[PDB]
Design a protein around this ligand. Structure first.
Ligand SMILES: CCCCCCCCCCCCCCCCCC(=O)OC[C@H](COP(=O)([O-])OCC(O)COP(=O)([O-])OC[C@@H](COC(=O)CCCCCCCCCCCCCCCCC)OC(=O)CCCCCCCCCCCCCCCCC)OC(=O)CCCCCCCCCCCCCCCCC
Ligand SMILES: CCCCCCCCCCCCCCCCCC(=O)OC[C@H](COP(=O)([O-])OCC(O)COP(=O)([O-])OC[C@@H](COC(=O)CCCCCCCCCCCCCCCCC)OC(=O)CCCCCCCCCCCCCCCCC)OC(=O)CCCCCCCCCCCCCCCCC
Ligand SMILES: CCCCCCCCCCCCCCCCCC(=O)OC[C@H](COP(=O)([O-])OCC(O)COP(=O)([O-])OC[C@@H](COC(=O)CCCCCCCCCCCCCCCCC)OC(=O)CCCCCCCCCCCCCCCCC)OC(=O)CCCCCCCCCCCCCCCCC
Ligand SMILES: CCCCCCCCCCCCCCCCCC(=O)O[C@@H](COC(=O)CCCCCCCCCCCCCCC)COP(=O)(O)OCC[N+](C)(C)C
Ligand SMILES: CCCCCCCCCCCCCCCCCC(=O)O[C@@H](COC(=O)CCCCCCCCCCCCCCC)COP(=O)(O)OCC[N+](C)(C)C
Ligand SMILES: CCCCCCCCCCCCCCCCCCCC(=O)O[C@H](COC(=O)CCCCCCCCCCCCCC)COP(=O)(O)OCCN
Ligand SMILES: CCCCCCCCCCCCCCCCCCCC(=O)O[C@H](COC(=O)CCCCCCCCCCCCCC)COP(=O)(O)OCCN
Ligand SMILES: CCCCCCCCCCCCCCCCCCCC(=O)O[C@H](COC(=O)CCCCCCCCCCCCCC)COP(=O)(O)OCCN
Ligand SMILES: CCCCCCCCCCCCCCCCCCCC(=O)O[C@H](COC(=O)CCCCCCCCCCCCCC)COP(=O)(O)OCCN
Lengths: 205, 127, 120, 77, 187, 82, 111, 438
């Protein structure tokens, strides 16, 4: 409007609908659909199955962290001097404990997420928040004062961030095209494509 | 002499200042004062808040006794020995419109119920 | 009783109690005519117990008189206007000399007045 | 450089000594007391809010009761 | 270091774009973006700040190039070359400041156009995680570039060698300033 | 003289704590070799990993960030003992 | 011991070598106080004495969060009343879960 | 319009060719010429053209410039207030930085392209880092704060602009586009959230103002805060109205909370500049809420209040700067007896403080009345909340005035001829707007 007399923006009729018009005459899709593996892992029906399918990721991350710390300890120890102690006995707890703690935290998160979703019966943000909060509570069992408040918050926030930018964002902005005519405005006289642009072939790596 | 009277100057600060020193108002003359008198330090007349509350507790019933009778115990019919001022129909109808009017308490009138409901009007605008 | 009063010796404490009681007699009175009988009554009250030597009884008397003088503190002390706590105290305070006045302020390096950005 | 920290004792005889100090500890209200007084005073401040809530609730309840009775009268008849 | 941190990249980007060498995985660019930004912020030495900036940016560029945006990577590499030339061949404080600003992506300089091409490409693919990471990592990188600006004009008197060999350096600074308006069509 | 921030701790105790970083420093090539090797094998393996939910991925990233130990931290605390 | 720096006629010169102190802008500066300066420093740098204690958390949550909650609840009530007043269908607000798509009233439509 | 833009481009250009000794005189003459060109732009703006008074394009969508009601008022305010900043600043380096900042800001207001808007407003990012972080009187902390807050908000705005340019195909305001996306609305909103200080993103402002030079503080409060309202009216409400209506309870919560917390924080301040900075933060909340109502009464009220603030805050910052030059202190505790010692400074200070409290003969009163009317149009409680809490501003202002008004002082610290000359235009403008020539 760019005036001071009437409200800015506009209004669209709710009664009047515009019949959908295809973006192009022929649509070629270079985006592959989700794999059967993805759907299997995503299935939260059985909490135990869901947990056991998704823990490998947490275990791997714990193993990488433990390997990192163990290597740092091993690198410093001197080869030239003989050591009374056994290095593996010193280093094995590091890796084992890190992997176990990571797996336990990821198990708690996955279990609570599946159990809440089943009990509630709906896929919602709350399920992620309560799983994160429970994981952060387990993380901060014996930590000083600030940490009990901070970790349940950071952990609860992480599934919120994942849901907003991993699931809601793409579905929200699926229609936008970028070529031909703007999604909403097809009356405007813009070049109309016979086929959609294919910027890349479907990936295979 | 109103002008030129002697004054005592407040001593310069010579010790670490308290964090909440902004509660003290000092212009440089000797008797500095709190931001709000009675917030701290000497209290006027040596009377605490508890003393004032006990006084108000003793006083409040005696002061409220006249008002509670007429407003609550008494009723329109029994409040006064006469009816509200009688007006011609054209004048009376207009006067009855005013919510803050004095003609709404005429029990003798056949429109008493409506007038009473008008007097106890809306708390806030409906729209 | 305040700490400063408490630290005082016995003699100074009783002198202070008499002084404060006389001032409070003045504050609660409606005229100078009332003051004279009340002040004579206060004098007689102190004179009556002056010869007491029992320390415990003296302490009891002092403490009670201090509680009475604390409760009967006036909301409005009668203070001379020119003294601290007075209406005309500080109304137009006398200015001290040695005031630092900068003459012709705008004409000192008039062209280059302003803030500079120094850089490294 | 800095101002002198030495006081002036010229008027000490006339207006009294500065020996007596304030007894305040310069600390604020307790947290428990503050919670009570904030949650008491703020509702008093927001008196219009409660009047609007009261009237709106009364209106909505009346309207719902009217609808219920209307339904009842429109069912049999 | 300057010639071998810019020139080699063009060949690899051309190979990737022309030979369809792209993967569905976004972890590697996301990692490069975050690691580079955090390491740039925690690095005391100025050479490490400049080296980690290239890691972060080339991670983002890798993510953009996998999705088919060849034109934007070829324009980015050219702007990045011109931006890096003046910071690396430091002789004048002003040239170095304009270079750091262009690497940072400030709008009056050509560096803004180069960053804009990548960011514009990112919004088309519509991946939320990448956009969020990009914003936060860019802020962290900006703190490192502010550190560089602080070191030159706000920390201590600076004296540098009089290496008066600015072959293309004056031209590069001019091309950075002036080039924004001609290349505005791209973004 | 100007007001300055109070430094917690005694001067000699803080300096002693700072001196625990002055230890034989390994070369970074040893760490880099292993990271390059395992990273190459990891990239090859990653193509075969199952597709994970975004929420699980983000949680794994959080756990990894929390469990990551800075190289300086191990360096300061490393003791050649059982 | 003092001299007038400013010259109205415009023939102003700074006598940097004058034995007598110039009455320049620096003449009127107020003398600082060692204790006041330290108070100013302490007041500005009050983040150093911040400590996370249950009392601090309680006070913060009760006043800041409490006000924010009260304000949100009031705004939601006012929006609900306005929607009822205007006759508009329940609007789809961000956190409200409404099975209605109404957001902006149609200017052409008569409500 | 073309004359204004040309004068704007000439002002930075002139410095390159000046003698380095005539810099201040040339800069002042250029500032006055830019003001006169702005008056010419006002003369050549016909009210008959209701939508945009004038639009000029120089070959591309980026070079599309135009003036509307908001743009016209803000541009005139910037041109009116710049001469004061110029005279207050000394040195070629300082002049160069200030003139570049002004050119970038003044070009941003008239820009009609989101990407061009971003290019022009954020160009003055390093210049503020350098200005606020100057060698002796600056703070690096404040510079880092302002720079990081600006970069993060403007980057979010840039991402939203890129999506709008990809989806619609253009990002020019003159092309009617509507979006219901909440991510894009949030991206555009975050810039407005930070630039116009709103709790909890207001921390950058007070630090910057305290450690900025008086010319910088005057420019910042006078017009830099207003750049948010141009972005709202020109780049947010046309496209993202649906999201402002969807989030109105949240917007109202955040704006009222900003107003309350900022007012309470102003009570704990001992530095005059911090007091003026927190007053600005409190005042910005009403403008933001009024514009978000998307009503005629609100948009006009917000712009009017912005002009009133852009006339009252520079005055207070100027008087504070003059006092600091005279005394080298900003602590209210050290400053006493200012009534007796500076009767002329005190009169203007009291007048400006009365203006800040929105008294009837000041522009703030009319502006506040209009903004409150817009809030009352939305809901009665909305207006009541804002009206009630206004007393907190009175408490802090009264306490400050009382501390400054009386006491014992041995220093005559009054304004010189130069200081009165600098505030006279601001006083006259305040009076004229107060009498109803808004
Ligand atoms: C005079 C006429 C010039 C007008 C047009 C030019 C075309 C005719 C060439 C005529 C020569 C003039 C040179 C100008 C352009 C150079 C191109 C070129 O030459 O080859 C192109 C031409 C054919 O290729 P093409 O036209 O590109 O099209 C092929 C396909 O379309 C595939 O190619 P494609 O990549 O172009 O595909 C289209 C592309 C779309 O691509 C485009 O749109 C390109 C945009 C143009 C940008 C221009 C900047 C590029 C920088 C290079 C500067 C030129 C250097 C000159 C080098 C050669 C000198 C002769 O779509 C894409 O998405 C691909 C991405 C492309 C890259 C992205 C563009 C961004 C570039 C970076 C910009 C960032 C800004 C940085 C700074 C900017 C500041 C302002 O080749 C020839 O004609 C023969 C080459 C012969 C050259 C030398 C031989 C003569 C001498 C022989 C013996 C030499 C020894 C003796 C020495 C004698 C002197 C001592
Ligand atoms: C047997 C050989 C031993 C190695 C074992 C394995 C060998 C490698 C095999 C395969 C390697 C490929 C994959 C490994 C990770 C990729 C990184 C890499 O390889 O670079 C080379 C790297 C050395 O490169 P460099 O350039 O020489 O060192 C640069 C640093 O400055 C180094 O200097 P610095 O360490 O002294 O400084 C560390 C600095 C460096 O900074 C970083 O680490 C940046 C990384 C941040 C995130 C990375 C991207 C995340 C995306 C992951 C993508 C997958 C998920 C998809 C979606 C997720 C969306 C984010 O970070 C810190 O300051 C410590 C904090 C840790 C992260 C900071 C973020 C905290 C956020 C949490 C918030 C909670 C706080 C709230 C309360 C706060 C109160 C106010 O080598 C390794 O570190 C490998 C060790 C493997 C341990 C990784 C632990 C988990 C791995 C996956 C989790 C993903 C997060 C990454 C966390 C830490 C990774 C460094
Ligand atoms: C045809 C008929 C003829 C009619 C004339 C028509 C011709 C049209 C234009 C011709 C005019 C000459 C152009 C001037 C070139 C040199 C200017 C310069 O060096 O600046 C400082 C210089 C002062 O020199 P100095 O005091 O003797 O000492 C400097 C020493 O060399 C070193 O001193 P330092 O080491 O102590 O450094 C301290 C530094 C503190 O450190 C910093 O702050 C560094 C910050 C990094 C850059 C600042 C970032 C923000 C700058 C925003 C741009 C300002 C305009 C804002 C408008 C928004 C535009 C999107 O502070 C400064 O240097 C000044 C602060 C503000 C100036 C920054 C603006 C300059 C931007 C780039 C300059 C152009 C160089 C190109 C090089 C060409 C070949 C080498 O010139 C000035 O008087 C102020 C700047 C004038 C700006 C106009 C230049 C145009 C740039 C705007 C970009 C728009 C695109 C270009 C199109 C222009 C029209 C086609
Ligand atoms: C219950 C409230 C019902 C009505 C509310 C109206 C007034 C409430 C409180 C009145 C405070 C105003 C008085 C004042 O400003 O004067 C103070 C100045 O005090 C201050 O500035 C402190 C700030 C007080 C102002 C606000 C505090 C009360 C706020 C009310 C509720 C608190 C929060 C609720 C919502 C924000 C000076 O103190 P005195 O020593 O008494 O001056 C009198 C002169 N003489 C020396 C001769 C005795
Ligand atoms: C549409 C254009 C925009 C797109 C940009 C890309 C296209 C480029 C278009 C213009 C390119 C201009 C490149 C500018 C280079 C600047 C010139 C230069 O570097 O000269 C050097 C050259 O230095 C040398 O090493 C000379 C060696 C070779 C000389 C030139 C080689 C010429 C070969 C033929 C080139 C013709 C092209 C062939 C057919 C296209 C001299 O500098 P120094 O003496 O080393 O130090 C300077 C000292 N100081 C400035 C401080 C005083
Ligand atoms: C940058 C965003 C990160 C959030 C920052 C918040 C502050 C961090 C503190 C950590 C707290 C953990 C994160 C909580 C934020 C979510 C908001 C809570 C609201 C809420 O509980 O409603 C849920 C939906 O909200 C939602 O989950 C979607 C709301 C989106 C979050 C807010 C977006 C804007 C915030 C940005 C403010 C400033 C940015 C700076 C960080 C339930 O929904 P439901 O569907 O489950 O219904 C229930 C049917 N069972
Ligand atoms: C960790 C962070 C937080 C931890 C601590 C938080 C503790 C705060 C909890 C209480 C805070 C105040 C209470 C407000 C929320 C009460 C419960 C919310 C549910 C609700 O909306 O009920 C409405 C409350 O009344 C209302 O509409 C609001 C009444 C109270 C507002 C006025 C009180 C103070 C006034 C001060 C000014 C603030 C507002 C200024 C505009 C009335 O129910 P409904 O009819 O709307 O039905 C709507 C369907 N539930
Ligand atoms: C003999 C010499 C007299 C010496 C001192 C007197 C000075 C001038 C006295 C009268 C002149 C008044 C003009 C001042 C501003 C009035 C602007 C104005 O109200 O007209 C608006 C023009 O639109 C616009 O966009 C105008 C923009 C330019 C206005 C100034 C912007 C602020 C610049 C700095 C403030 C100084 C002002 C002086 C539209 O008015 P409307 O459409 O809203 O309807 C009008 C009912 N409200
Ligand atoms: C917790 C209180 C919220 C704090 C914000 C207070 C006031 C902000 C209002 C700004 C006005 C316009 C912004 C539009 C929405 C922003 C926040 C609205 C509240 C919100 O989070 O709603 C969510 C949807 O919004 C979204 O999905 C987007 C959320 C924002 C994204 C965060 C960062 C995005 C940055 C992207 C940069 C540019 C990207 C451009 C491509 C979920 O609500 P729901 O509808 O699902 O209800 C389910 C509950 N049961």
């Amino acid at each position: 409007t760019f005036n001071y007399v009437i409200p800015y923006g506009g209004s669209s009729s709710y009664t009047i609908n515009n019949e959908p018009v295809k973006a192009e005459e022929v649509t070629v899709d270079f985006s592959k659909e989700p794999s059967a593996s993805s759907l299997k892992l995503a299935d939260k029906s059985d909490w135990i199955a869901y947990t056991f399918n998704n823990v490998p990721l947490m275990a791997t991350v714990g193993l990488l962290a433990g390997a990192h710390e163990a290597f740092l300890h091993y690198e410093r120890t001197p080869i030239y001097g003989k050591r009374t102690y056994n290095i593996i006995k010193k280093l094995a707890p590091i890796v084992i404990n890190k992997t176990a703690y990571a797996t336990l935290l990821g198990a708690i998160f996955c279990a609570t997420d599946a159990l809440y979703e089943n009990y509630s019966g709906k896929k919602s943000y709350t399920s992620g928040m309560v799983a994160g909060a429970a994981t952060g509570a387990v993380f901060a069992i014996g930590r000083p004062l600030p940490q009990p408040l901070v970790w349940p918050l950071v952990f609860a926030a992480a599934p919120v961030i994942a849901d907003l930018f991993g699931e809601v964002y793409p579905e929200s902005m699926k229609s936008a095209r970028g070529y031909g005519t703007p999604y909403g405005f097809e009356n405007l006289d813009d070049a109309v494509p016979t086929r959609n642009p294919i910027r890349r072939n479907p990936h295979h790596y | 002499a109103g002008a030129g009277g002697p004054v005592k100057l407040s001593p310069p600060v010579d010790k670490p200042l308290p964090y909440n020193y902004d509660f003290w108002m000092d212009n440089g003359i000797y008797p500095g004062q709190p931001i709000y008198d009675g917030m701290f330090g000497s209290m006027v007349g040596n009377m605490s808040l508890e003393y004032m509350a006990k006084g108000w507790l003793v006083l409040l019933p005696i002061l409220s006794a006249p008002f509670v009778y007429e407003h609550c115990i008494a009723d329109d019919v029994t409040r006064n020995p006469f009816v509200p001022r009688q007006y011609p129909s054209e004048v009376r109808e207009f006067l009855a419109l005013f919510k803050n009017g004095f003609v709404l308490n005429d029990y003798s009138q056949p429109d008493y119920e409506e007038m009473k409901r008008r007097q106890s009007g809306l708390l806030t605008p409906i729209y | 009783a305040s700490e400063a009063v408490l630290r005082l010796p016995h003699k100074l404490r009783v002198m202070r109690m008499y002084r404060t009681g006389l001032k409070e007699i003045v504050n609660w009175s409606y005229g100078r005519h009332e003051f004279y009988p009340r002040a004579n009554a206060l004098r007689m009250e102190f004179e009556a117990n002056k010869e007491l030597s029992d320390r415990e009884q003296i302490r009891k008397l002092v403490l009670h008189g201090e509680d009475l003088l604390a409760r009967f503190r006036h909301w409005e002390p009668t203070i001379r206007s020119e003294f601290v706590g007075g209406t005309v105290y500080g109304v137009w305070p006398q200015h001290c000399k040695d005031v630092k006045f900068v003459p012709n302020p705008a004409y000192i390096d008039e062209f280059k007045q302003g803030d500079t950005v120094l850089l490294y | 450089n800095y101002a002198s920290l030495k006081a002036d004792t010229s008027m000490d005889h006339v207006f009294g000594d500065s020996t007596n100090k304030l007894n305040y500890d310069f600390q604020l209200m307790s947290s428990k007391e503050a919670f009570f007084w904030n949650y008491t005073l703020y509702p008093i401040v927001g008196f219009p809010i409660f009047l609007y809530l009261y009237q709106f609730n009364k209106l909505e309840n009346f309207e719902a009761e009217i609808a219920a009775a209307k339904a009842a009268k429109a069912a049999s008849e | 270091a300057f010639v071998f941190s810019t020139l080699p990249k063009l060949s690899v980007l051309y190979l990737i774009s022309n030979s369809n060498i792209g993967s569905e995985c976004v972890w590697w660019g996301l990692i490069s973006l975050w690691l580079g930004s955090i390491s740039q912020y925690q690095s005391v030495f100025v050479r490490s700040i400049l080296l980690y900036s290239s890691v972060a940016e080339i991670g983002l560029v890798l993510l953009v190039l996998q999705e088919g945006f060849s034109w934007e990577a070829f324009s980015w590499v050219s702007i990045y070359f011109l931006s890096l030339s003046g910071v690396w061949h430091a002789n004048s404080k002003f040239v170095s400041a304009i270079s750091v600003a262009s690497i940072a992506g400030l709008p009056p300089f050509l560096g803004f156009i180069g960053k804009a091409q990548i960011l514009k490409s990112l919004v088309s693919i519509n991946l939320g995680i990448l956009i969020f990471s990009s914003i936060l990592a860019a802020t962290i990188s900006f703190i490192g570039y502010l550190r560089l600006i602080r070191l030159m004009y706000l920390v201590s008197p600076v004296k540098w060698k009089n290496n008066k060999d600015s072959s293309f350096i004056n031209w590069s600074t001019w091309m950075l300033t002036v080039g924004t308006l001609p290349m505005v069509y791209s973004v | 003289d100007e007001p300055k921030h109070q430094i917690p701790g005694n001067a000699l105790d803080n300096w002693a704590f700072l001196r625990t970083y002055a230890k034989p420093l390994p070369d970074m090539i040893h760490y880099y070799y292993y990271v390059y090797l395992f990273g190459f094998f990891f990239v090859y393996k990653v193509a075969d990993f199952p597709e994970y939910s975004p929420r699980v991925l983000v949680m794994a990233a959080l756990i990894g960030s929390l469990f990551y130990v800075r190289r300086d931290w191990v360096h300061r605390e490393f003791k050649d003992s059982p | 011991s003092s001299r007038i720096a400013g010259d109205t006629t415009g023939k102003y010169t700074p006598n940097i070598f004058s034995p007598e102190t110039p009455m320049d802008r620096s003449f009127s500066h107020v003398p600082k106080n060692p204790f006041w300066e330290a108070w100013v420093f302490r007041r500005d740098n009050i983040q150093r004495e911040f400590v996370w204690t249950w009392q601090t958390i309680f006070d913060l949550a009760t006043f800041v969060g409490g006000l924010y909650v009260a304000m949100y609840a009031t705004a939601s009530f006012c929006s609900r009343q306005n929607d009822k007043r205007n006759g508009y269908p329940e609007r789809n607000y961000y956190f409200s879960d409404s099975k209605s798509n109404f957001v902006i009233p149609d200017e052409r439509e008569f409500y | 319009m073309s004359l204004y833009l040309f004068m704007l481009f000439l002002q930075p250009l002139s410095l390159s060719f000046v003698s380095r000794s005539f810099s201040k005189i040339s800069s002042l003459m250029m500032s006055f010429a830019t003001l006169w060109s702005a008056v010419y732009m006002w003369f050549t703006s016909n009210g008959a053209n209701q939508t945009f008074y004038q639009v000029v394009s120089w070959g591309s969508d980026w070079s599309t410039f135009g003036v509307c009601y908001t743009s016209l008022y803000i541009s005139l305010l910037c041109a009116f207030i710049f001469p004061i900043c110029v005279i207050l600043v000394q040195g070629y380096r300082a002049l160069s930085i200030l003139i570049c900042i002004q050119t970038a800001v003044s070009l941003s207001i008239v820009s009609l392209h989101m990407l061009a808007f971003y290019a022009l407003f954020e160009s003055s990012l390093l210049l503020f880092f350098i200005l606020i972080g100057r060698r002796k009187y600056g703070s690096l902390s404040a510079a880092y704060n302002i720079s990081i807050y600006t970069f993060i908000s403007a980057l979010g705005f840039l991402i939203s602009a890129f999506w709008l340019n990809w989806s619609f195909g253009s990002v020019c305001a003159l092309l009617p586009n509507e979006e219901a996306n909440s991510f894009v609305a949030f991206g555009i909103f975050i810039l407005l959230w930070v630039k116009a200080p709103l709790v909890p993103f207001h921390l950058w402002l007070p630090e910057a103002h305290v450690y900025a030079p008086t010319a910088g503080s005057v420019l910042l409060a006078g017009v830099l805060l207003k750049i948010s309202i141009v972005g709202l009216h020109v780049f947010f409400l046309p496209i993202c109205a649906s999201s402002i209506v969807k989030a109105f309870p949240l917007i109202l919560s955040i704006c009222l909370g900003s107003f309350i917390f900022s007012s309470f924080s102003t009570l704990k301040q001992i530095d005059l500049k911090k007091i003026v900075a927190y007053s600005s933060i409190s005042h910005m909340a009403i403008v933001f809420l009024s514009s978000a109502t998307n009503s005629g009464l609100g948009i006009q009220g917000a712009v009017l209040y912005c002009i009133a603030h852009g006339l009252i805050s520079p005055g207070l910052f100027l008087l504070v700067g003059i006092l600091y030059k005279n005394t080298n202190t900003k602590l209210v505790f050290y400053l006493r007896g200012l009534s007796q010692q500076a009767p002329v400074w005190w009169s203007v200070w009291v007048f400006f403080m009365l203006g800040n409290l929105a008294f009837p003969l000041f522009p703030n009163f009319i502006a506040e009345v209009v903004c409150l009317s817009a809030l009352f149009k939305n809901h009665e409680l909305y207006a009541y909340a804002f009206i009630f809490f206004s007393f907190v501003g009175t408490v802090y202002s009264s306490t400050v005035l009382g501390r400054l008004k009386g006491g014992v002082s041995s220093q005559c610290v009054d304004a010189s001829r130069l200081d009165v000359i600098s505030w006279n235009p601001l006083v006259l403008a305040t009076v004229v707007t107060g009498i109803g020539y808004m």
